[PDB]
Design an enzyme around this catalytic site. Structure first.
Site, short mmCIF file in Angstrom:
data_model
loop_
_atom_site.label_atom_id
_atom_site.label_comp_id
_atom_site.label_asym_id
_atom_site.label_seq_id
_atom_site.Cartn_x
_atom_site.Cartn_y
_atom_site.Cartn_z
N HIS A 55 40.13 33.19 25.72
CA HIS A 55 39.25 33.59 26.81
C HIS A 55 37.77 33.50 26.43
O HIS A 55 36.91 33.77 27.27
CB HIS A 55 39.61 35.01 27.25
N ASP A 197 39.30 25.36 36.93
CA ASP A 197 39.44 26.69 37.52
C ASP A 197 39.36 26.60 39.04
O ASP A 197 38.60 25.80 39.59
CB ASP A 197 38.37 27.65 36.98
N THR A 252 48.16 34.92 36.37
CA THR A 252 48.80 36.01 37.10
C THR A 252 48.99 35.58 38.55
O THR A 252 48.15 35.82 39.41
CB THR A 252 47.97 37.28 36.99
#
Length: 484
Positions: A55, A197, A252
């Site tokens: 991250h 992203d 997630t």
């Protein structure tokens, strides 16, 4: 917006064309977060993207950067040398966390990156000294304090600081290879670069009708009144989307979100991307390590328009106008918070983040009656903040989502005022509740003045009294708000 969108975004153009193809074949209104052109040439070269494994993202400088490094001086902690030891520790635990499938392979170098980055003035045309006994292509980096030496004849990178200068760090790292992370796709190992992203999606109602089995949509045919439609979309969301598994492999997501992202991402198998899923993690609202304020987002529609926004409040304007203002559900990944707040999962995340430093407060580490009573109050508070985003009642105009959102917010406010009749709490959780009550009253007031009826806030709090039922008080809320 336009080709300025794709160039100030920094993505592959033919990836965008493949996304247009799969959007014309699937009709899903997805969004994208921009990733720069430093790593994008390596996406076009053949080394694929990382996941949610490291991250600490790659830098915006460096001809050898773009990949996630072990020593995080090649990361966002440039010059902040006290955090590079924590960076080496966090990449030690990132290596030892994802074991079983990860290897140790360095960056696959090319001469073409430094000639396509000639604009930084990389080569000084002065003296040509043969350092380390090898014919080296002498480069001077963005600064003098550290040189990022790309090799000329070695497959591994021979990056090594100079042997005549001293810094504040003191760890003159040797001419080792870079230690970037890996991921086994179809057996063959591959390095990990800066991952692409996304932000959200807003698919068409017939695509959800054909992707969720037909019984739930022959339910839609016999729905005369809107409360039964509210019940159908809410329990559809309970039986489908509450199974958010906190994972660190692909992001997630839910099940249907993951398989539709895979079907939306498989379109690059005939274009030049040898990996398939060009996005291997969630969003930055789904990356919970650091809250990054996304300054601009990329807009992709199945019609074929390329929009890159400018402002964040204007981004929320675009969302509430194009996504929520029309008949499309807002499937986003779930004092200055006017319309869109951090959601209920982020509410429990903020609760735990304040809990880690606050020893006492509303409720403590025990199990008494006030303890579990305020625990059930805060779980139904989380339920009301979740049902605040009931963005699927769009059969009538946006006023219906407005009045349903105000009903859920006023239920939440009555829950907050139910909590505050307890013992003498700590001031940290106290002004936490003060910020939450001020935010929810300002949000409900500025939505009420936007929608209709000119009513005060305290008037609607005083006239509404619900005790043990919510399917009866929606009628008195409708009688106050509507039917003037």
């Amino acid at each position: 917006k336009g080709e300025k969108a794709l160039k100030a975004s920094g993505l592959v153009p033919e990836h965008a064309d493949a996304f247009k193809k799969i959007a014309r074949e699937l009709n899903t209104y997805i969004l994208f977060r921009p990733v720069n052109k430093l790593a994008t040439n390596l996406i076009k070269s053949g080394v694929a993207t990382k996941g949610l494994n490291v991250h600490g993202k790659s830098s915006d400088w460096g001809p050898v950067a773009g990949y996630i490094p072990f020593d995080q001086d090649l990361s966002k902690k440039h010059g902040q040398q006290l955090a590079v030891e924590k960076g080496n520790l966090e990449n030690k635990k990132s290596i030892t966390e994802h074991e079983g499938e990860i290897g140790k392979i360095p960056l696959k170098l090319d001469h073409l990156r430094i000639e396509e980055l000639k604009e930084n003035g990389i080569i000084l045309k002065g003296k040509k000294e043969i350092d380390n006994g090898k014919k080296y292509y002498l480069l001077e980096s963005n600064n003098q304090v550290y040189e990022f030496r790309i090799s000329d004849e070695n497959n591994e990178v021979q990056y090594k600081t100079k042997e005549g200068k001293i810094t504040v760090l003191g760890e003159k790292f040797n001419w080792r290879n870079i230690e970037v992370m890996a991921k086994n796709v179809e057996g063959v190992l591959k390095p990990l670069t800066a991952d692409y992203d996304l932000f959200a999606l807003a698919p068409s109602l017939t695509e959800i009708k054909k992707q969720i089995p037909q019984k739930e949509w022959d339910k839609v045919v016999n729905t005369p009144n809107s409360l039964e439609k509210q019940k159908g979309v809410t329990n559809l969301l309970i039986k489908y989307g509450i199974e958010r598994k906190p994972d660190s492999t692909k992001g997630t997501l839910s099940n249907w979100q993951k398989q539709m992202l895979d079907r939306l991402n498989e379109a690059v198998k005939y274009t030049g991307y040898t990996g398939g899923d060009v996005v291997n993690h969630g969003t930055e609202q789904d990356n919970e390590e650091f809250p990054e304020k996304d300054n601009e987002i990329f807009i992709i529609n199945p019609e074929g328009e390329f929009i890159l926004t400018k402002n964040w409040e204007m981004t929320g304007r675009f969302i509430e106008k194009n996504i929520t203002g029309k008949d499309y559900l807002y499937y986003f990944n779930r004092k200055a918070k006017i319309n869109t707040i951090p959601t209920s999962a982020e509410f429990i995340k903020n609760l735990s983040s304040i809990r880690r430093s606050s020893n006492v407060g509303v409720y403590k580490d025990s199990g008494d009656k006030d303890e579990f009573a305020k625990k059930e109050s805060v779980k139904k508070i989380a339920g009301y903040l979740s049902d605040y985003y009931n963005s699927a009642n769009h059969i009538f105009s946006q006023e219906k989502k407005r009045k349903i959102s105000i009903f859920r917010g006023i239920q939440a406010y009555n829950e907050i005022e139910n909590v505050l009749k307890s013992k003498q709490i700590a001031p940290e959780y106290k002004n936490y509740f003060q910020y939450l009550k001020e935010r929810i009253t300002n949000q409900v007031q500025l939505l009420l003045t936007h929608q209709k009826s000119n009513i005060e806030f305290k008037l609607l709090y005083k006239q509404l009294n619900f005790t043990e039922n919510e399917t009866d008080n929606f009628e008195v809320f409708q009688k106050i708000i509507d039917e003037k």
